[PDB]
């Protein structure tokens, strides 16, 4: 969503479900904005 950063470790996608943009985490990352490394 523009050049103002939202998701950390992932791709941004619109959740028409909750009507707010969500983050699609890449492997080994968790969180609402994919901000954490999952050490497990």
């Amino acid at each position: 969503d523009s050049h103002t950063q939202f998701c950390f470790h992932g791709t941004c996608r619109f959740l028409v479900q909750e009507d707010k943009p969500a983050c699609v985490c890449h492997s080994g990352y968790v969180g609402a904005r994919c901000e954490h490394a999952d050490l497990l």
Partner: antibody, heavy 118, light 113 residues
């Protein structure tokens, strides 16, 4: 204005389960994590897990072996903490704390005393 | 999984004297953005913890200037310049960089007499 309000004390027999509640007010509920911390007597602090209520997301402390369950009521701005198969070791003050993305535990609930006894 | 280790354990410091609490992470706790989500909390009996320091060195709004945090990737310290009667509590470091989140063991500060 930001308040985290927990339910009252519990006495639960060994083996049973306990649901602790947390009413959150003064901010948008889908915009912060609701964390859970516990503290057994004389003992230090133990993070249990977290919940993002928006597009619902959880992460728990593995040391609990999936006994802890964190739910969120969008309608009533409450996040629940359910802990199953209660042991004497689970006797503690259960806390909930607010955390914004990569921000600290600025807000805390008063605590909930759960006593596990026969 | 990260192991936060508080070095002092129990600290007895006279009034107005300097108090230093040490904490250590087993693995690096530097976030991908280059920030380190290490925080200090103060807890008094029959009370929920209070935020003191966040992001290693940032003093939370309303915290007296006597409180200050500092660190280096795995080693971190909480400092009280001049101990006050009010500062007698248990201090916890916290790691919120990586999941799972980790609390330290805690350090009791008492008045040395």
């Amino acid at each position: 204005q930001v308040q985290l309000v927990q339910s009252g004390a519990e006495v639960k027999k060994p083996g049973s389960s306990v649901k602790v509640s947390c009413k959150a007010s003064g901010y948008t509920f889908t915009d912060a994590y609701i964390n859970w911390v516990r503290q057994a007597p004389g003992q230090g602090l133990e993070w249990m897990g977290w919940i993002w209520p928006g597009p619902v997301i959880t992460y728990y402390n593995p040391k609990f072996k999936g006994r802890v369950t964190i739910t969120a009521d969008k309608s009533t701005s409450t996040a629940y903490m359910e802990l199953s198969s209660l042991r004497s070791e689970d006797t503690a003050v259960y806390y909930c704390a607010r955390r914004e993305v990569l921000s600290p535990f600025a807000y805390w609930g008063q605590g909930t005393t759960v006593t596990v006894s026969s | 999984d990260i192991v936060m280790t508080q070095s002092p354990d129990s600290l007895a410091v006279s009034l107005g004297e300097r108090a230093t609490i040490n904490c250590r992470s087993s693995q690096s706790i530097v976030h991908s953005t280059g920030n380190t989500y290490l925080e200090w909390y103060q807890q008094k009996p029959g009370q929920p913890p209070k935020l003191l320091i966040y992001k290693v060195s940032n003093r939370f709004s309303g915290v007296p200037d006597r409180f200050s945090g500092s660190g280096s990737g795995t080693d971190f310290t909480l400092t009280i310049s001049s101990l006050q009667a009010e500062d007698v509590a248990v201090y916890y470091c916290f790691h919120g960089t990586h999941v799972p989140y980790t609390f330290g063991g805690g350090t009791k500060v008492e008045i040395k007499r």
